[PDB]
Design a protein around this ligand. Sequence first.
Ligand SMILES: *[C@@H]1O[C@H](CO)[C@@H](O)[C@H](O)[C@H]1NC(C)=O
Lengths: 49, 50, 49
Amino acid sequence: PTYGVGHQPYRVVVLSFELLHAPATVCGPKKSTNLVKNKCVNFNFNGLT
Amino acid sequence: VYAWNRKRISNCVADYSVLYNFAPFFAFKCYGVSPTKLNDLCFTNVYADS
Amino acid sequence: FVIRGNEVSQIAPGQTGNIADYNYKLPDDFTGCVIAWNSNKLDSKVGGN
Ligand SMILES: *[C@@H]1O[C@H](CO)[C@@H](O)[C@H](O)[C@H]1NC(C)=O
């Protein structure tokens, strides 16, 4: 603890993300609405807008 | 700072990775070169202002 | 993991050094996040940790 800063200990967590190629398992809070076909709508599929 | 100390460094082999063992600093800011590659390229004279 | 404060800049794509070449290496096409915080009070001992 008497060491100067920059030599002090630090804790590191690296979050490595895997992009969408498989079906998704980790998805955050966003409620899914009903499916609408045969109409020009905006759509969001697992983060793809 | 009005009389900053300038020292000429020449005719020697430099190892900048030893510099992290000298002073407790976070980063090694550089313009023109990179802190990663400084052991690869080499220079004529190195001037240290303090 | 736990790293010294002057080596956090080694946790990045395209960086080499001691830890970035021997302990933990990140890919150049990394898609993720790096989180670092000071933990001197939790990892510092007056007799040396
Ligand atoms: C600086 O020099 C003193 C006396 O030679 C020595 O005790 C100390 O460990 C040195 N510190 C560094 C960082 O080299």
